[PDB]
Amino acid sequence: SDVFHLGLTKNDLQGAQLAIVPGDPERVEKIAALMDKPVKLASHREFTSWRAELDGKAVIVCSTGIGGPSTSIAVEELAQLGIRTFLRIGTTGAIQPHINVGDVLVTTASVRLDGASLHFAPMEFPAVADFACTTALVEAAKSIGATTHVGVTASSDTFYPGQERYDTYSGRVVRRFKGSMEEWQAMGVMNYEMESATLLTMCASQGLRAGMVAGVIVNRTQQEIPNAETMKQTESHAVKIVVEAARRLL
Amino acid sequence: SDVFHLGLTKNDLQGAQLAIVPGDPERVEKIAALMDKPVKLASHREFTSWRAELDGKAVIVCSTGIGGPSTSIAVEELAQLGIRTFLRIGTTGAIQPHINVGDVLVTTASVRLDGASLHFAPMEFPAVADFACTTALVEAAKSIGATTHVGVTASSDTFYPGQERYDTYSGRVVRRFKGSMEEWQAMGVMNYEMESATLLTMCASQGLRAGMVAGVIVNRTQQEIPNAETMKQTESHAVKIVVEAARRLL
Amino acid sequence: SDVFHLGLTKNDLQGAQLAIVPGDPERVEKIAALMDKPVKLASHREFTSWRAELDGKAVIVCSTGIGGPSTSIAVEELAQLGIRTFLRIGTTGAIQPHINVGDVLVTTASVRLDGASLHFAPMEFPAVADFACTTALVEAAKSIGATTHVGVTASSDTFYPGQERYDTYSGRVVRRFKGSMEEWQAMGVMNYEMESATLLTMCASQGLRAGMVAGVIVNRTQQEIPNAETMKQTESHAVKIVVEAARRLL
Amino acid sequence: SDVFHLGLTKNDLQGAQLAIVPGDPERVEKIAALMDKPVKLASHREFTSWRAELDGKAVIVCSTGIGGPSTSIAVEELAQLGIRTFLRIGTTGAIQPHINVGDVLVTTASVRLDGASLHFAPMEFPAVADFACTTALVEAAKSIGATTHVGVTASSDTFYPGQERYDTYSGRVVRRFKGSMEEWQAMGVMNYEMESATLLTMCASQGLRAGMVAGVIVNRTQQEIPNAETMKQTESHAVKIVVEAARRLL
Amino acid sequence: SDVFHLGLTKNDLQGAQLAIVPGDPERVEKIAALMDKPVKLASHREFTSWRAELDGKAVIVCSTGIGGPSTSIAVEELAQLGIRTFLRIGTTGAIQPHINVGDVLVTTASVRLDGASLHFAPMEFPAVADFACTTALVEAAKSIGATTHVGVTASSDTFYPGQERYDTYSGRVVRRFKGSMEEWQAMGVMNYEMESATLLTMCASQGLRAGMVAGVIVNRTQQEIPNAETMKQTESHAVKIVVEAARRLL
Amino acid sequence: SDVFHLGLTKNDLQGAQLAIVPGDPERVEKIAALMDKPVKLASHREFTSWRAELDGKAVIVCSTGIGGPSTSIAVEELAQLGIRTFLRIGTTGAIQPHINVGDVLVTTASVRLDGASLHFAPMEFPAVADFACTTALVEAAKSIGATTHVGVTASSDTFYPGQERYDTYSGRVVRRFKGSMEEWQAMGVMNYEMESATLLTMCASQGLRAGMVAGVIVNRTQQEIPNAETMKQTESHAVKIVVEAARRLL
């Protein structure tokens, strides 16, 4: 085609400028089952892309995969095929008690705890979402009436220490993070994830717009445990949400 | 007695929730004035606050001073008196060729090249604008008919080495601070204010709604003679946007 | 004239190279009054100059404002107007148990807790006060019989988080400044303050003779009463010492 | 399952305690095809794991993915199930002119040019490899006669954008990582990679041994388009080399 | 006569390419004492060096003194004079309970808690020992039959704070070094010393092999009462190791 | 005895509470030559300890060694034995063209370009000299009417690889030391050297009066090289200045 690790050409999109990029590519297919006339574009490494329409428009849903080292690849190669709006939808677990599993999270900006974003702009520069993609994500959630949360997200690079988890092998998080989470709550940040730091900033630093929505799948605070049975919320909600939000900014 | 700097008391606030924090008091009342029952409360160093009303509510108009260190005081002496919303109004300049003098720039967040922000949250945390205050300042520039620009702002502690200008003889500049403009320009930053850095961050890290609207009085980009008419005209419009923006946040 | 910022020119300055610069604008006149034939000069921002004369040579007390970015402008313009000597006088919080309210403090060098300092010199570079001024000032100290102390001051860009105050809105302190006071105290630092660093640095780095003197208005240790107008006899002291001191340097 | 990402249980390894962690899964399946009793255990996300035998020993050959974020999860979730030693292998290029295709680069320690590493240890701590591991690797290339080079590898978070080189689209070519590739070379570095630094640091600091043998399938400094077959060849030797390293290491 | 500090010239090493560099100049004769045709070359300051031979090969036995600024001097001087391989021997204080006195520690790459090393390579770069030199060291401590431990060593620029020692005058360590011991031990670092980082660093970044072995003199984590004469046999072990290991390379 | 490195006991100091900290052991005696009833106490590695008595008061003179690491031990161990004041006297190169070899300079504070200081106080903490100790030196030079220059100095960790000397092996530098000394001219720094940084910092932060005199035995930048005829006179200028100074601190 022209890219590399995505193997989609330049016509596979047919004037596609938006892209609902999710984490696991297991989701990319079900995300498009929500829209119309899709197509399994490609699927190379962990970059599974589809192609669906909407309101007479052409948008694609490409999976980005764990962390920005990969994330940038997708954003990189997709944004050069044409996409100028990157809508991210994934799962997560929040750090604040006031957030009930099954609440959606629209994120204005994320706490950069990664070293990849630094490859696009200084640590001074913010990993802030796009207003258009942000209002179009809080109205979307409100449209279905979901108890949405807008704030900031702590975008770490590790699933264990950057998120201060002690239920691990060593059972010890490095000094810089010994207490990070208790600091994150006091500052109001909503949860933890690992791809927004890259996306937010690499988009915000080059004529690209983007936003992030996520569904609280679990939550490392609320005592009583959920139910997997009711973990499908990502479907009728977040997934629905992103498809709807994308509708708007189409 | 009371508040060490601002010098007020809760009684003066009269249960006020909001507060328009401009720079100088020379134009602090001009905001108040546009409100109902404007009443000068206190005025000490450069901490000059009034008090009016909006839709039966009470608003405060305290000035901040120069640089984030000064503001940090108002925004803290203030918040203790009750206020939880801080809208900041002020005129500004532009780095982008496609931005004009009548335009209004709504800061989503700002690159934190300031200094007092780090007193509140590591340079990793985002200096992002609270959705409401971000959205509210858009509603206005659209209800009055003004052209608005969303985006990121540069927030340094210098009046010259940070806005592309060097003629104040000595005035050294570390290895970094040099040609920075050309950088941000490619990154999308629009203006070079100096306060929002602490405003956004300090409030963000401490659970507070806050936004910042700025009328672009001038713009270096072109070699066009900048008249004085609009340098006053667009301001009033910038005063109308916040004022029209405070009405919603009450 | 040649300055609209501070509003003056060399011609205005009477042609004198020395400016006692305080942070409070309501003290400028108050110090120039103890000088000779002082004439009100201007009042733009919190920067308010008051020309005068001492022992046969002109002097221009000019308020510098709160915070190093405030003082940057201050010192910066006064300097390209003529001044080659600066003597800061103000209110300060003492950390040490034995430093008493009313006592006078002379700053040799200070811990850098600002940002403006960096818009002038790397942090490996010292925030050191001019020996001559340190000497002139310390000398003038005993010239009245004040209980003086000499040493490192801690210059924070924030009154609360930077000087580790917890009785604020949120009540927490970024880990960076958490424990600090203990560490400063142990490290010998004798007082908190927010302007000397930008000063001593901006001057030190280039060719300028800056100096620092303050008076304990509050002691962040003892549990007694901070009196009523405990912000007067102190100014009486220091103003004298900064006037006696400068008088010598001139 | 017993983990949250790999999809394996602390029972699908049967002692294992050793694993080989490469980029893509396409390799971990053929990697295992070299040891006896291949048994594909899972494939959840970028983590595809196989079980095999070697002199009656249980061994895991799970893939890491892209970047330390992914790799961190594997090495972490593995170490939990028993793996106490992680051996890495990868294809690569070399910046050193004298280094040619088909050579093996056993790495002792890598230049922590990443942010992931930081979640496990300070920048002053070395990203160093285990002694037995670097030996079992070096010795196994000896019992193969492959031009081996032992030393330090570079590992940041990029492969085209935000790097130093010039070729993507646009103009911004980073700052901190500009014209640095030169120093990395005269620093004696060999290859450029992106997952080591984490592997070495998250193992070197958490009581877990790890090694790394890679292959030179291409050389930039060397003006010559490599060979497709040499790469099938080169790949092969690294495979035997790492499997043979894993062999003695039990 | 030549350089200054060392007190040598090229024709005093006699083609020697290896230098054994211990700290104590009182201990140079004891090491050269075990080789053929020993000869004293210079004694200026702390830089004491003897010239020897092994298997018919002239080997320089030079000192470095206390600290790395001086260590650079040494290493830097020698290399200029021919030496391309430095064998550093020392004594030390182990921080791991499992490690007792009389044992032998081989340093793979040490923590750069030093500073002079930054004058050679970015902190990112690893203070890695030369592989070869390490092997010879480890197989040397075994041939003599010595309880050995190989791994990470911590190199501090100070002997009191740097190694979190509190039995000092001030009885106070800085934040960067408070509770840093549990840190180092938990991370797995085996000991503390003061020069490794500068050697391992200026050599690895400058095409020079280098190795270090040390003799346990104290155990930071110790509880049993140290026996009778605890030193005499301690300090001589690594002497025959360093010399033996020195053979294997030559 | 009571001290580990120096090897002395409290009685050996004989109530002494002040010490002259030179660089090498040749000087420690020439200094003790002037003072009344000098006695050699010890000489372990680089620290040669001597005792004297100025005006009837026990004065200690001990060597510190090359680089900060070494200094810190002599200092601390001295302070453990009852010394509160440290007079530094040595010889140095000048970066200023209005300054010449044969001149004496006092360092009010230094440009922390070292690594050992950082283990006493953050890089924000200033390297200033105790007023009393630095005042009894600029005035103890008037007793000799010599070209006295007093400002800050630049304490490095290495000679040329820490200041940039186009002639050595490393060539330029790892992008930092590519003209700093030229920056320091602009900064106003008068001379270049090493220990002071650590010396001031560790004393300034621990409650120990500290000072520093030195003369130019070479016009460092201004192409020069010392000699016996002159070099002695200069070393006398300082040896006396530092003994005369030391007299007044008792």
mmCIF file of N, CA, C and O in Angstrom, chain A residues 140-164:
data_model
loop_
_atom_site.group_PDB
_atom_site.id
_atom_site.type_symbol
_atom_site.label_atom_id
_atom_site.label_comp_id
_atom_site.label_asym_id
_atom_site.label_seq_id
_atom_site.Cartn_x
_atom_site.Cartn_y
_atom_site.Cartn_z
ATOM 1 N N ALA A 140 -22.677 12.987 24.092
ATOM 2 C CA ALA A 140 -22.927 11.617 23.646
ATOM 3 C C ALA A 140 -23.305 10.738 24.841
ATOM 4 O O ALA A 140 -24.316 10.027 24.809
ATOM 5 N N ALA A 141 -22.486 10.794 25.888
ATOM 6 C CA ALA A 141 -22.732 10.024 27.102
ATOM 7 C C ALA A 141 -24.032 10.489 27.736
ATOM 8 O O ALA A 141 -24.789 9.674 28.249
ATOM 9 N N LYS A 142 -24.284 11.797 27.688
ATOM 10 C CA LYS A 142 -25.498 12.388 28.253
ATOM 11 C C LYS A 142 -26.722 12.027 27.427
ATOM 12 O O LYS A 142 -27.831 11.903 27.958
ATOM 13 N N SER A 143 -26.499 11.857 26.127
ATOM 14 C CA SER A 143 -27.549 11.477 25.196
ATOM 15 C C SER A 143 -28.127 10.128 25.619
ATOM 16 O O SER A 143 -29.340 9.936 25.565
ATOM 17 N N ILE A 144 -27.276 9.187 26.026
ATOM 18 C CA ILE A 144 -27.800 7.896 26.464
ATOM 19 C C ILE A 144 -28.057 7.965 27.965
ATOM 20 O O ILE A 144 -28.527 7.001 28.577
ATOM 21 N N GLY A 145 -27.742 9.123 28.543
ATOM 22 C CA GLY A 145 -27.956 9.349 29.963
ATOM 23 C C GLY A 145 -26.977 8.683 30.916
ATOM 24 O O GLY A 145 -27.297 8.475 32.088
ATOM 25 N N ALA A 146 -25.781 8.362 30.428
ATOM 26 C CA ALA A 146 -24.759 7.713 31.248
ATOM 27 C C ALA A 146 -24.105 8.655 32.253
ATOM 28 O O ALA A 146 -23.748 9.792 31.915
ATOM 29 N N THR A 147 -23.946 8.166 33.485
ATOM 30 C CA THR A 147 -23.322 8.944 34.557
ATOM 31 C C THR A 147 -21.850 9.202 34.189
ATOM 32 O O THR A 147 -20.943 8.559 34.705
ATOM 33 N N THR A 148 -21.631 10.157 33.292
ATOM 34 C CA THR A 148 -20.295 10.485 32.807
ATOM 35 C C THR A 148 -19.425 11.251 33.782
ATOM 36 O O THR A 148 -19.941 11.943 34.662
ATOM 37 N N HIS A 149 -18.105 11.103 33.625
ATOM 38 C CA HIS A 149 -17.104 11.809 34.443
ATOM 39 C C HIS A 149 -16.062 12.483 33.551
ATOM 40 O O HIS A 149 -15.423 11.825 32.725
ATOM 41 N N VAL A 150 -15.891 13.790 33.716
ATOM 42 C CA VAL A 150 -14.880 14.498 32.949
ATOM 43 C C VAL A 150 -13.861 15.035 33.933
ATOM 44 O O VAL A 150 -14.216 15.668 34.920
ATOM 45 N N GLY A 151 -12.596 14.744 33.663
ATOM 46 C CA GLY A 151 -11.503 15.174 34.516
ATOM 47 C C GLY A 151 -10.206 14.803 33.822
ATOM 48 O O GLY A 151 -10.143 14.899 32.592
ATOM 49 N N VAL A 152 -9.188 14.388 34.582
ATOM 50 C CA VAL A 152 -7.896 13.980 34.005
ATOM 51 C C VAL A 152 -7.589 12.509 34.291
ATOM 52 O O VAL A 152 -8.081 11.933 35.268
ATOM 53 N N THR A 153 -6.767 11.900 33.444
ATOM 54 C CA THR A 153 -6.413 10.495 33.612
ATOM 55 C C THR A 153 -4.915 10.343 33.730
ATOM 56 O O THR A 153 -4.186 10.963 32.978
ATOM 57 N N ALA A 154 -4.454 9.528 34.672
ATOM 58 C CA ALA A 154 -3.015 9.299 34.859
ATOM 59 C C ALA A 154 -2.518 8.232 33.869
ATOM 60 O O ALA A 154 -2.675 7.028 34.093
ATOM 61 N N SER A 155 -1.911 8.685 32.774
ATOM 62 C CA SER A 155 -1.428 7.777 31.733
ATOM 63 C C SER A 155 -0.008 7.202 31.990
ATOM 64 O O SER A 155 0.989 7.749 31.510
ATOM 65 N N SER A 156 0.079 6.103 32.745
ATOM 66 C CA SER A 156 1.372 5.470 33.055
ATOM 67 C C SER A 156 1.895 4.668 31.859
ATOM 68 O O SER A 156 1.286 4.689 30.795
ATOM 69 N N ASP A 157 3.027 3.983 32.040
ATOM 70 C CA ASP A 157 3.643 3.154 30.995
ATOM 71 C C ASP A 157 3.698 1.692 31.428
ATOM 72 O O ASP A 157 3.942 0.799 30.618
ATOM 73 N N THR A 158 3.494 1.461 32.720
ATOM 74 C CA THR A 158 3.492 0.119 33.266
ATOM 75 C C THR A 158 2.132 -0.106 33.904
ATOM 76 O O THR A 158 1.523 0.829 34.430
ATOM 77 N N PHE A 159 1.659 -1.348 33.845
ATOM 78 C CA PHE A 159 0.359 -1.705 34.398
ATOM 79 C C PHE A 159 0.488 -1.970 35.886
ATOM 80 O O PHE A 159 -0.510 -2.042 36.603
ATOM 81 N N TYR A 160 1.723 -2.084 36.357
ATOM 82 C CA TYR A 160 1.925 -2.374 37.761
ATOM 83 C C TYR A 160 2.477 -1.244 38.627
ATOM 84 O O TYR A 160 1.753 -0.727 39.473
ATOM 85 N N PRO A 161 3.740 -0.827 38.431
ATOM 86 C CA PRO A 161 4.235 0.261 39.289
ATOM 87 C C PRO A 161 3.692 1.671 38.980
ATOM 88 O O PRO A 161 3.327 2.414 39.893
ATOM 89 N N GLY A 162 3.641 2.050 37.710
ATOM 90 C CA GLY A 162 3.123 3.366 37.376
ATOM 91 C C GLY A 162 1.748 3.586 37.971
ATOM 92 O O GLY A 162 1.297 4.712 38.136
ATOM 93 N N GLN A 163 1.077 2.493 38.299
ATOM 94 C CA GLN A 163 -0.248 2.563 38.883
ATOM 95 C C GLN A 163 -0.204 2.175 40.352
ATOM 96 O O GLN A 163 -1.232 1.971 40.988
ATOM 97 N N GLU A 164 1.008 2.095 40.879
ATOM 98 C CA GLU A 164 1.248 1.733 42.269
ATOM 99 C C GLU A 164 0.446 0.511 42.709
ATOM 100 O O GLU A 164 -0.483 0.630 43.499
#
